[PDB]
Symmetry: D2
Subunit: 259 residues, 4 copies
């Protein structure tokens, strides 16, 4: 077969599950159903307890969980060396990690703090660069890296503020990584997801406003879910997307195409 979505014999690291609503979990459910071996990474202990509870919903024989705060060079370097020891070589990484201080997001963008801006950049963009460098060690045959972005990296959207500049950074990060790791047969791409109700998104002002605008104005007149992101993640992580790199696929009911 030329075209295949059979991921038995494939191993993927999934960074950024927090609870059942996490986009990264949508990616996990889908990759699991297609028979991939899945390694998971988390920051907080609360995410670990949830992960173990969630793995029962999946068909992963062995829970391989690793604590990686992407703010620490060491936790990232050691985390990936340790994954290499425990499961061997991998076929890709799904990156589902962002953070900004609520103080900066609530503010006017011009009021953003130097510390808040560099924090958003560090977690939401630089993380992908170091994750890529370490994961490359486990992908000598080649593989696929995917990161999660939002329209706010391409256009100034109300309230996204500092995270918009972080996502623009991430999106350019993807392109520079694609050009750098291409000759090593490593593809780097992004999924621009439409708004999804998650732990991160719950209790940020006017999120219900954007959900309703998508239903009313977006071509498909509906919102997307974690599984739809997972399906496009399957395409980008598998060899189905061979010849695609430096690309940004909008899984957003067509909202990106309209004005």
């Amino acid at each position: 077969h030329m075209a295949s979505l059979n991921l038995e014999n494939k191993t993927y690291v999934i960074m950024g599950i927090a609870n059942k609503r996490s986009i990264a979990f949508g990616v996990a459910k889908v990759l699991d159903q297609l028979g991939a071996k899945l390694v998971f990474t988390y920051r907080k202990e609360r995410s670990r307890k949830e992960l173990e509870k969630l793995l029962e919903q999946l068909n992963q024989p062995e829970a391989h969980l690793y604590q990686i705060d992407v703010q620490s060079d060491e936790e990232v370097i050691n985390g990936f060396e340790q994954i290499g020891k425990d499961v061997g070589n991998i076929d890709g990484v799904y990156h589902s990690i962002a953070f900004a201080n609520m103080e900066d997001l609530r503010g006017r963008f011009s009021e953003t703090s130097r510390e808040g801006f560099l924090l958003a950049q560090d977690i939401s963009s630089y993380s992908l660069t170091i994750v890529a460098h370490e994961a490359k060690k486990l992908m000598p045959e080649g593989g696929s890296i995917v990161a999660t972005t939002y329209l706010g990296g391409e256009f100034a959207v109300q309230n996204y503020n500092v995270m918009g500049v972080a996502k623009a950074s991430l999106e350019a990060n993807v392109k520079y990584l694609a050009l750098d790791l291409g000759p090593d047969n490593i593809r780097v791409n992004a999924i621009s997801a439409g708004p999804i109700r998650t732990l991160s998104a719950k209790g940020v002002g006017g999120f219900n406003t954007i959900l309703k605008e998508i239903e009313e104005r977006a071509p498909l007149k509906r919102n997307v879910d974690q599984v739809e992101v997972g399906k496009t993640a399957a395409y980008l992580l598998s060899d189905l997307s061979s010849g695609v790199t430096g690309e940004n696929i909008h899984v957003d009911s067509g909202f990106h195409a309209i004005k």
Copy 2:
């Protein structure tokens, strides 16, 4: 959920001419995944080739239809007839462009009014009318994919009138996506890198562009019809649910660099 099993799916494929046609790469891939395939052609030469090619495939019943997309009638009748012979479809792959060599050889400012509107008619408007008629056979929803080139987004040497046609096509895709979205019809494009085809063979310095892709593109290699077919499988299937008005570059990353 996630599936590349396309048994019980039916797709119309417009624009096979020979074994090198991008549309044939799409056919080979969709066939392997178990889809029922309807084919459309213009010239009789394409029909003879299609029948010879269908032996390479596992299609029980050869359903072939003559549609020159310049004729409202051939398009309207072609699709009504497909609806009668096989019933409702799940999508259309559009693999059709043409411009006069006179216009392509020229300086773009020398382009003829007739040559410009011809390129627009075949290469862009075709998708609008194909979409209108195919919508009749997709009352549950479906996916339409058209084939474009980077030259629709940037001025490329020698693409001339076809660049303005592809920019037209790419905007066509977006307006169709917004129009047919509420009918649960997705409309997307694949921006293929350079591939040696019947259409492309015997346009000067095509080997030069192939070598520039190998040297400068991130993956340091060219793409083929099957790689387009793989991305077509994604866009035509429900794997790409929630993706519409999108342009996916199957071009080894060339679009991302300068």
Copy 3:
């Protein structure tokens, strides 16, 4: 050389004045105040009567008016040969011409007629290609060509339908012309104007809706006028914009930058 907006000794052809509200007239008022010699082109006789009435508002010694319907190779070729005879060599052309059948604009975009689509393409896009070819004859030293576009060429906007695909065609036309005529020191650029109340725009459904959305959502929280387009036209037509070609400048209160 050093920076000047003094356009005495410069001559510009302005295509597409119809009445006092025409964007092209905003361009004329501005270029006139800066002391340029202005040649004008029109289609209908109604536009000629209006032009002569309007020229009294300007400081053009000699009225040079020419009938050019851009659908006719002959009217365009002869028009420009005749301009070359009557005023000699020119420094640029401002293109302010578009048209589609209201039947096509009122419809669903998928219902668009083959004749209506090619009509929109012919007047709204191809016109620039042949205008450029003939005007090049009068610009052996070099010059600047500017065409007028709308955001609907970059994004699917409700109700713009066939004219959006025409503007995308125009915008690509600008790029290919810029690459072709660049070596002849001819610059080709576009202005993406925000919504303006004109003869063409008056009595097309939901135009008041877009005007109000611009005031509410656009960065500058206001609409633009013909003169603001004229000011940016002065920049693009003069040597102030040397080194700028294949560019699309949005004169739209920042609406293009947001989502």
Copy 4:
């Protein structure tokens, strides 16, 4: 207030951040704004830049040299610098931002090898600087005004060897858009100029810069490179009221290279 279109900048005052020597893009902006009769305030980091500025001001027609030391890495130097400009010359009509930096270690490397410290440094100087400069300069622009920052194509496309600075420029370009939306209601316009390659102090002695200069001459529509003055001309347009109604825009002053592939 008689010509609708005007490039006469007598009675206008502009802060110009990032002159280092005669080759600096910011100096091209200065020469042009000066010729049009603007009052110019200048900002620098190193003392070497101050000595050069004083030597350069003789080439201009600025009666009183107003020079201020602002390292954009320091909230204090930026806040105090702008308060002090407000005291010495009063309200301003805009800011030209011509400031970027990355460690040569990071630029020479493979982009995937980039250090966390090097990445955040590039972001801090090359992008965040504009956000805080904008916040403080807004205090001196209660009537409104225009802010322009300098970027390169490498913020929009992966270009060989630009590495971490490409991600910094993409950050800057998004910064411009978010600033445009935030400060628009205060009648402050925020725009970028994407300059083609120019021989400057910053650019001199980075490998393969001569390669890109030659590729521009061969492949770009105008078949020629641009200079600091051409950037200055487009800066005059963006800084003056000639560009009224333009904000969140990125104007390529690059002989059309951005339009081709």
